[PDB]
Design a protein around this ligand. Structure first.
Ligand SMILES: Nc1nc2c(ncn2[C@@H]2O[C@H](COP(=O)(O)OP(=O)(O)OP(O)(O)=S)[C@@H](O)[C@H]2O)c(=O)[nH]1
Ligand SMILES: C=C[C@@]1(C)CC(=O)[C@]2(O)[C@@]3(C)[C@@H](O)CCC(C)(C)[C@@H]3[C@H](O)[C@H](OC(C)=O)[C@@]2(C)O1
Ligand SMILES: [Mg+2]
Lengths: 890, 333
């Protein structure tokens, strides 16, 4: 992916650019410091030729400093790549100024060591660019020896060693550049993957929740969500299954039933009837949305609003009467094409309702009260095509609407009714912006929490074996650097060199014991254990650092050797080893780094000062001793500053990425928990296959979801005594305790439904105090009818038990039937699983025309359980048909 | 402040004295209709005594036959829906009450159904005959009023609020109890300990004490009262003591286990107490603790108390003890 990798380069360019901002600032200090000491050395002013080139060089570094800031603000980063080239050429040119003209007469070879290391450490140039930039300085060092032949006169040999001194910078420099870039690739790759997973899970969470919120309004879904989270420690003290009901006031209830349903039911089959029903009811849902209703349920051929239930409205019944006029208009519209005569009747009443859910399975929003019963009776009144505006509503709307005298006498005269990308950039940008002053220490870059730093320390160094290899090569090169350098005790220094080169190899084999499979596992475990804990690796990293330093100084201690500046660069060749060791902490690196300079400061003062003096007089030149020890610590200063800032920036980036990874993981965990809660609620609301079909696309593309089944049993269970039991006094809040008892009954039924004995039976819905369940919907034999019969008997037993526990008598009317049904969703916007057919109406009629406490059943297709009452002869709704009743199994 | 308030309800069988307990508690810490109810109670008592003169299978001997027109007058006005209140009727009632045959008929009141406050108002015919006085609070507590629905009385003692819940006790009214079984601090079960001799007026077969025991069994094992920790309030202790002191009726005559039962080692050493009353009260209490403990799980506990709802000192002492119990219980250890 060239587009993604280029996108990484734009991100990678900025982080490396932050390093060169201080290094260009570092360079301008280098020019003035060398210029100042040259001014202070001689009372007479320096050569005017000397000042001009450094003036260009000390001025261009200011320009690059003022050029990187503007490009960082700019969205493009082309000049950031150029800035590394502009900086490299500026310092690389410095060599020509010294070699041919005057330039920076101080230092010399050591200064080239500083920049040639620089162009592999802080320059945002890619790895391929670094080799070209590094080789340019190295090949120009070859030009330096030609333009300064007296340097070759100083050392006829060791000129190859001088190139070797500059060869290991390329060898060690690519190691830092490649590993640091590789680690940056993983950090960018990981932060790109984590955001991809977070966005993937958020869309699913919002899509899953959008279906749950389609039904079950928010003001009860919030209560359910709070309940399932277990907000308190435990709810070990519970006596009731709890309810989610609330009382509302100043609402209006509509109703509608098809007058001639049975006449047209026999004319056409089930599929066409379902099609017309869905068309009418979907247009009706659109009308309800237009007129501020919210439908509660669709039972058979019935449809009813609640006006202003979740939010109050001053004109609450106005919306109901307007949408009722819309009901009439839509019925007239569908009356076109001379198809049928499905005209209906509408009844409206206003009052107080109790809204909530009952039971544990297939939760559905409903309303129970006495006033909804008044609305139901007003609808059942009659005169299809006309509304009922009984006194509780006529005085509600206004006196501005003219309505007739109302019904004469159609319903029972009881109770006196009185009718009348850029995100990822801001993803990275907000990480640094928030963490400018936050959990990380402003300078030590340490997390405030001890555990957060500790869980960082346990992370293993994946390049520890490769990083320790780098320390071996540089220590091997200083051995080759010094081996050809002359000394008095050539053999005695080699014996110590052999020990030191073996000491590093001793740690090499120990730290590569895991790499050495042939070596025993116990040794391999120690290698893993070394990198497992940060402190055990820190001492080894410190240890391997020392061996490079001991090897780099022991040669000088042998000297009592006429080239004292070349032995100094070996310490510079040891300071890179600290920069190589990326993982070790920054402040710990400064403490060990401060040891290197302090020892060299002690070895560059009066001790071995005479050895520097004999070098001064031999070279002579123009006061070049300012390029000697006077500049030896000057080189050490810039090298130390560069190495320290490299370590600091590397640790800064690493800590930032770790902290953001932790934050993203926490967000992912929280979102996963929310997903689990939503999944639980959705599973409780709707069946599996229906929920899966409605979750993805084609929720509204397919207006009708339906399926035809052949062998399905249908059962109804009614409690006629609850209407007499129900009463709205003041002691019970408004009947809330009666609804609590009803919820207890329904919850007992639902819990009984969960037994393994009843696997083929699924609860469809509850109609007020009626319980409806079907048998054998999922084919996976007439055993499911037997299961349904056992379910009815168990329901009778449960109602008897709860009657015993309470202090009143309740009786169940059970109606069963068997046949072919059609199961599907009738509302695309609000998915409510439902079934239709002729056996459903037969079951409802058999339940309605029955005696309490007894089960009425059609033609007995089973001989397993014996029935009785064959001579019952119930006319029903279709035609007269005599069939039996249902006793127990025996 | 809803949690601070305590909700208490008085669940008990019929004629258990819970309403009397509520009245006494109300007058402890805070018209002509009451006079009318006293008159009606005395009226019902005298009419039932006159009817039971002849209704019982074992005939009760009468007084001097000349003093019989009074009986005919009481029988005649009893059928009248609107009973008269003339001085002549009160003279008739006093004449019956002083008669020895009527006294013997009253002594057999356990055979038929009669209010327990009959003799208190029957001793008050002379003062009620003038129909010009206001009965005292003690006479107010003797009134017999049927409780149909459930009633609440707000309470406040020592800066803490209490809630009262008076409910009916008849088998027809037991279906309304579920309306207030939620978030209740404790149940104050009241049992008429002296009703071991009589029977309930709804079936006329089961003993009142047996019905109360069945009610307590139903309440204790109720699935919606698993952790409620009922409090037991034995009532009518004075009536039980009087009945057991008379010797006409015995607890053994209706409960065979009583004869073998012995007084427990732990007892309340009341100075004005007899071994018989102690053994009777402890037999009843041990029956109730047995039925409670057989199903005991440690979730809820019962604290039996002996109470006489007529006198106010026993009421206030038992109420103080129960208030300490309810405070410790609201502590929710
Ligand atoms: N002598 C005596 N009479 C009592 C005692 N306790 C209550 N009574 C009387 O018994 C009568 C019945 O008490 P009451 O409060 O009406 O029972 P209840 O439980 O409320 O009656 P119900 O609603 O269940 S039908 C009252 O008139 C009262 O005066 C008592 O301890 N001793
Ligand atoms: C349980 C509630 C109670 C007592 C009052 C009530 O609002 C109902 O639930 C309605 C009216 C009400 O829920 C609206 C739908 C429907 C189906 C019309 C119910 C039935 O008529 C219930 O009666 C039966 C017997 O199912 C009924 C009337 O019973
Ligand atoms: Mg009462």
């Amino acid at each position: 992916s060239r587009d993604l990798e280029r996108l990484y380069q734009r991100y990678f360019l900025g982080q490396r650019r932050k390093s060169e901002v201080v290094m260009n600032v570092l360079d301008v200090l280098t020019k003035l410091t060398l210029l100042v000491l040259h001014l202070s050395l001689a009372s007479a002013p320096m050569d005017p030729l000397k000042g001009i080139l450094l003036g260009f060089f000390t001025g261009i570094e200011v320009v690059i400093c003022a050029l990187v800031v503007v490009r960082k603000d700019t969205t493009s980063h082309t000049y950031l790549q150029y800035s590394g080239v502009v900086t490299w050429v500026a310092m690389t040119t410095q060599i020509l100024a010294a070699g041919l003209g005057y330039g920076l007469l101080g230092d010399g070879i050591g200064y080239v060591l500083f920049t040639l290391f620089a162009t592999y450490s802080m320059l945002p140039l890619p790895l391929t660019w670094a080799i070209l930039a590094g080789l340019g300085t190295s090949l120009m060092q070859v030009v330096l020896q030609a333009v300064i032949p007296r340097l070759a006169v100083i050392s006829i040999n060791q000129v190859v060693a001088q190139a070797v001194l500059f060869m290991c910078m390329n060898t060690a420099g690519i190691f830092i550049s490649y590993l640091s870039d590789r680690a940056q690739r993983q950090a960018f790759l990981e932060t790109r993957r984590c955001v991809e997973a977070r966005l993937r899970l958020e869309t699913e969470n919002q899509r899953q929740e959008r279906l749950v919120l389609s039904v079950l309004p928010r003001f009860v879904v919030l209560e359910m969500i709070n309940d399932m989270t277990n907000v308190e420690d435990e709810h070990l003290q519970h006596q009731f299954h709890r309810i989610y009901i609330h009382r509302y006031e100043n609402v209006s209830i509509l109703f509608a039933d098809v007058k001639g349903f049975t006449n047209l039911s026999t004319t056409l089959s089930a599929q066409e009837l379902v099609r017309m029903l869905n068309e009418l009811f979907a247009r009706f849902d659109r009308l309800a949305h237009e007129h501020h209703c919210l439908r509660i349920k669709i039972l058979g051929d019935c449809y009813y609003c609640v006006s202003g239930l979740p939010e109050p409205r001053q004109d609450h019944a106005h919306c109901c009467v307007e949408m009722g006029l819309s009901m009439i208009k839509t019925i007239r519209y569908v009356r076109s094409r001379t198809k049928h005569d499905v005209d209906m009747r509408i009844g409206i009443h206003s009052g107080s309702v109790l809204c909530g859910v009952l039971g544990l399975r297939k939760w559905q929003f409903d309303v129970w009260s006495w006033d909804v019963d008044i609305a139901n009776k007003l609808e059942s009144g009659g005169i299809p095509g006309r509304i009922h505006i009984s006194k509780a509503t006529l005085d509600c709307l206004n006196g501005d609407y003219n309505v007739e005298e109302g019904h004469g006498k159609e319903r029972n005269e009881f109770l006196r009714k009185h009718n009348i990308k850029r995100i990822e950039h801001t993803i990275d940008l907000r990480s640094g912006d928030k963490l400018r002053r936050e959990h990380i220490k402003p300078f030590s870059l340490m997390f405030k929490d001890s555990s957060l730093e500790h869980k960082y320390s346990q992370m293993r160094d994946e390049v520890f074996k490769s990083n320790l290899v780098c320390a071996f090569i540089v220590l091997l090169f200083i051995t080759a650097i010094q081996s050809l350098l002359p000394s008095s005790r050539v053999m005695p220094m080699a014996i110590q060199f052999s020990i030191l080169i073996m000491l590093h190899s001793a740690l090499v084999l120990i730290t590569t014991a895991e790499d050495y499979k042939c070596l025993p596992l116990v040794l391999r475990k120690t290698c893993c254990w070394i990198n497992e804990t940060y402190l055990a690796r820190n001492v080894i990293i410190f240890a391997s650092i020392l061996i490079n330093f001991l090897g780099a100084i022991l040669n000088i201690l042998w000297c009592d050797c006429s080239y004292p500046e070349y032995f100094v660069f070996t310490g510079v060749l040891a300071m890179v080893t600290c920069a190589v060791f990326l993982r070790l902490n920054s402040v710990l690196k400064l403490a060990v780094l401060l040891i290197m300079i302090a020892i060299y400061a002690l070895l560059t003062e009066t001790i071995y000062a005479g050895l520097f003096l004999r070098y001064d007089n031999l070279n002579h030149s123009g006061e070049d001793f300012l390029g000697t020890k006077e500049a030896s610590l000057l080189l050490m200063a810039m090298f130390l500053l560069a190495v320290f800032y490299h370590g600091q920036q590397l640790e800064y980036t690493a800590r930032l990425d770790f902290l953001w990874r932790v934050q993203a993981k926490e967000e992912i965990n929280e979102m996963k928990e929310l997903r689990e809660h939503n999944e639980n609620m959705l599973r409780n609301i709707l069946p599996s296959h229906v929920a899966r079909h409605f979750l993805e696309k084609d929720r509204d593309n397919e207006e009708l979801y339906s399926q035809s089944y052949d062998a399905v049993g249908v059962m109804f269970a009614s409690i006629p005594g609850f209407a007499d039991f129900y009463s709205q006094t003041e002691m019970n809040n408004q009947g809330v305790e009666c609804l609590r008892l009803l919820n207890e009954i329904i919850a007992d039924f639902d819990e009984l439904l969960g037994e393994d004995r009843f696997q083929d039976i699924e609860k469809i819905k509850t109609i007020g105090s009626t319980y409806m369940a079907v048998s054998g919907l999922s084919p996976e034999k007439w055993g499911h009818l037997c299961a349904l019969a056992d379910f009815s008997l168990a329901l009778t037993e449960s109602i008897q038990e709860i009657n015993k526990h309470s202090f009143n008598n309740f009786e169940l009317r059970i109606g069963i039937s068997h046949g072919s049904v059609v199961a599907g969703v009738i509302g695309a916007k609000k998915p409510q699983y439902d079934i239709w057919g002729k056996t459903v109406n037969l079951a409802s009629r058999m339940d309605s025309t029955g005696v309490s406490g007894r089960i009425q059943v059609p033609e007995e297709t089973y001989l397993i359980l014996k029935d009785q009452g064959f001579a019952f002869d119930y006319r029903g709704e279709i035609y007269v048909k005599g069939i039996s009743e249902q006793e127990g199994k025996i | 402040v809803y949690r601070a308030t305590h909700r208490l309800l008085l669940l008990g069988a019929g004629e258990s004295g819970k309403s009397t307990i509520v009245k006494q508690m109300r007058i402890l810490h805070v018209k002509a209709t009451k006079v009318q109810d006293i008159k009606n109670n005395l009226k019902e008592a005298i009419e039932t005594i006159v009817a039971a003169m002849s209704n019982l299978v074992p005939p009760v001997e009468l007084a001097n036959p000349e003093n019989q027109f009074r009986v005919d007058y009481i029988l005649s006005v009893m059928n009248v829906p609107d009973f008269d209140f003339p001085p002549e009727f009160y003279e008739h009632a006093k004449a019956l009450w002083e008669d020895e045959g009527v006294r013997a008929c009253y002594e057999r009141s356990n055979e038929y159904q009669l209010i327990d406050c009959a003799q208190y108002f029957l001793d008050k015919i002379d003062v009620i005959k003038q129909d010009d006085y206001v009965p005292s609070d003690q006479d107010l507590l003797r009134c017999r009023v049927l409780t149909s629905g459930i009633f609440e009385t707000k309470f406040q003692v020592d800066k803490v609020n209490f809630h009262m819940f008076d409910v009916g006790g008849q088998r027809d009214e037991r279906r309304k109890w579920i309306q207030c079984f939620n978030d209740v601090t404790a149940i104050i079960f009241v049992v008429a300990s002296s009703s071991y001799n009589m029977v309930i007026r709804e079936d006329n077969q089961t003993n009142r004490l047996q019905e109360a025991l069945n009610l307590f069994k139903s309440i204790w094992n109720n699935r919606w009262l698993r952790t409620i920790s009922v409090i037991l309030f034995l009532n009518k202790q004075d009536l039980l003591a009087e009945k057991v002191l008379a010797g006409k009726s015995k607890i053994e005559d209706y409960f065979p286990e009583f004869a073998r039962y012995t007084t427990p080692e732990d007892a309340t050493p009341e100075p004005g107490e007899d071994p018989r009353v102690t053994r009777a009260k402890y037999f009843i209490r041990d029956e109730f603790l047995r039925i409670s403990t057989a199903s005991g799980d440690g979730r809820h506990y019962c604290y039996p108390h002996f109470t006489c709802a007529v006198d106010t000192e026993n009421i206030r002492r038992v109420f103080n003890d129960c208030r300490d119990i309810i405070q410790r219980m609201h502590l929710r250890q």
